[PDB]
């Protein structure tokens, strides 16, 4: 009963083989290059296994409307060749088994929903903070997909009055991702994020920005758990600042222990560590396989 | 097959009797006073009719978790007597028929979802802009209820650099409601909203603020239709400014015609005019009645 997953990133692809309970049997990774040659490496890796289904969690924006002619393509990216490349369809054509598709952060959300911190709940929100910011939400046990999947990393939070950085996002400048991604932390401070470890000021600022973003998500979706992952969130100090700032921002407007005394159990790192997304792509495989039996 | 509705407002109650197709048979309104005497007027009006069920759409925050001990109470308000008053339970006890409960804007959303601009869709967002700002969302045909219902009117949008008004909201100051409610427009400009009709500047500012709020809701929920109601939105000029500003804010990040060329059919006034909420309380009645048959 083996399943394949592809977590398509802008810098790397991670492919894996595993089971529906989330165990990883095997995995490989390789640099993201042009699509033809990148997917060819994908196919070459899976050809060794007898797989029943595959799931793709891709960086987006993507067309995640099953009824759309461009379903399963990346709809916007500056990365050469990926926009409008028939990603889902080329994998379906070559492997000839069901293939599920979603964003990478939707994949992480399913992982943490079935096997991680949101197991037993019916709602959660997974936010990744790395090269980009993105988030995926589960409402009533099902991924949130409206007109588009969400693009929660491009909301315009309020600047800090002492921050003079113009922002990294090429569309918005100083949206959340623009102010608070890993690359925004570097462009702002002049060194790599992992190396700013001991400059408290960087992490108060980062936490202030995440906190503002979370206030909005709480007011708008009100998820029953918020899981924060990605490279930047390896600085576990950021959590303590978020815990201090969310309540100050909300200012007691919504009386839930999740938002005050027990906030440290509401906004948490992922139980699956950095594997939420790849594990979640096994879930997307499994769903695709069940939809074909249906 | 007659149903009752109560739209509980901070200034007035509107009660009505009607049918599940949304027709209003009769209605009454009266000032919101203390609860005992206000609910007593409610009971006195319904005693004339043979009703099968009732629905309450209340101003909130409210406890809208069916499994909660304080289910069907208003959990926060400065209005004398209403906090923690057993509103739902006192109506259930006196009428002895099923009673549905939700926010007032959730009620409006159901109205427009079954009978208005979102009929045939599976998702929508209803926003009221009046004494307060609030919103209710339908995802996959079902009201969005997480940890709390949403309180979308208290998000911290960005100020306009020329606006020096400190904000009306007693919790946040210059959150969205704080900047853009009817009373914020008056406290800011020194006259009543209906009388600022011809000062274009008031409505550019109002539209700029709504537009910022909508950008966030689109990025976070991505609803398939956005309906704007309430007293302030009787100045239909505000729509033209929103249509100009949403696309500038999003800056082509999400390529959907709803967000650009066809934006005038995406963000719209309610088809049910100012009766979305009361009509929606008939829907909540009908749902409560079906849950009892189940
Ligand atoms: N241990 C770390 N601590 C802080 N920042 C890190 C760490 N590792 C990577 N980063 C930063 O996070 C970003 C990478 O995000 P990540 O989730 O690791 O991958 P990607 O977003 O490229 O798929 C980079 O800008 C990098 O500087
Ligand atoms: N025709 C109108 N044009 C502009 N503003 C209005 C109009 N009617 C009422 N208002 C304003 O909208 C607010 C009232 O909101 P509304 O939805 O009518 O009721 P409430 O929020 O009290 O239930 C007030 O601050 C008032 O000044
Ligand atoms: O991968 C992190 C996030 O960055 C984006 O590509 C755009 O900001 C999102 O689609 C994604 O979920
Ligand atoms: O009634 C308009 C809106 O104002 C509030 O009472 C708080 O801002 C919300 O609960 C409501 O939906
Ligand atoms: Zn952006
Ligand atoms: Zn507020």
From Swiss-Prot, chains A, B:
Zn(2+) binds at residues 154, 169, 172, 175. Inhibited by zinc ions. It catalyses: D-fructose + ATP = D-fructose 6-phosphate + ADP + H(+). Induction: Up-regulated by konjac glucomannan and by cellobiose and mannobiose, the possible degradation products of glucomannan. Repressed by glucose via the carbon catabolite repression system. Also repressed by GmuR. It comes from Bacillus subtilis (strain 168). Belongs to the ROK (NagC/XylR) family. The keyword Magnesium applies. It is an enzyme of class 2 (transferase). The keyword Zinc applies. This is Putative fructokinase. Seems to be involved in the degradation of glucomannan. It holds the Pfam family ROK. Keywords: ATP-binding, Carbohydrate metabolism, Kinase, Magnesium, Metal-binding, Nucleotide-binding, Polysaccharide degradation, Transferase, Zinc. Its EC number is 2.7.1.4. Its cofactor is Mg(2+). GO terms for biological process: polysaccharide catabolic process. The lineage of its organism: Bacteria, Bacillati, Bacillota, Bacilli, Bacillales. GO terms for molecular function: ATP binding; fructokinase activity; metal ion binding. ATP binds at residues 131, 183, 231-235.
């Amino acid at each position: 009963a083996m399943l394949g997953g592809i977590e398509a990133g802008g810098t790397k692809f991670v492919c894996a083989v595993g089971r529906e309970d989330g165990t990883i049997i095997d995995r490989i990774e390789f640099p993201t290059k042009m699509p033809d040659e990148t997917i060819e490496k994908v196919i070459q890796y899976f050809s060794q296994f007898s797989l029943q289904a595959i799931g793709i969690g891709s960086f987006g924006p993507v067309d995640n409307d099953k009824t759309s002619q461009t379903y399963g393509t990346i709809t916007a990216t500056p990365k050469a060749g990926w926009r409008h490349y028939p990603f889902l369809q080329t994998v379906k054509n070559e492997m000839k088994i069901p293939v599920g598709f979603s964003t990478d952060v939707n994949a992480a959300a399913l992982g943490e929903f079935l096997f991680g911190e949101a197991k037993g709940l019916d709602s959660c929100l997974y936010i990744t903070i790395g090269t980009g910011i993105g988030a995926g939400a589960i409402v009533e046990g099902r991924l949130l997909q409206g007109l588009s999947h969400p693009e929660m990393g491009h909301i315009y939070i309020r600047r800090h009055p002492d921050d003079v950085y113009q922002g990294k996002c090429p569309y918005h400048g100083d949206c959340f991702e623009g102010l608070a991604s890993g690359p925004a932390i570097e462009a702002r401070w002049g060194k790599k994020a992992a190396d700013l470890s001991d400059i408290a000021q960087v992490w108060e600022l980062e936490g202030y920005y995440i906190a503002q973003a979370l206030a909005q998500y709480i007011l708008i979706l009100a998820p029953k758990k918020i899981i924060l992952g990605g490279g930047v969130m390896q600085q576990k100090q950021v959590f303590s600042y978020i815990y201090q700032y969310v309540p100050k921002i909300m200012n007691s407007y919504l009386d839930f222990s999740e938002l005050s005394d027990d906030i440290s159990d509401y906004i948490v790192p992922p139980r699956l560590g950095s594997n939420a997304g790849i594990i979640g792509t096994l879930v997307l495989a499994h769903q695709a396989l069940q939809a074909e039996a249906a």
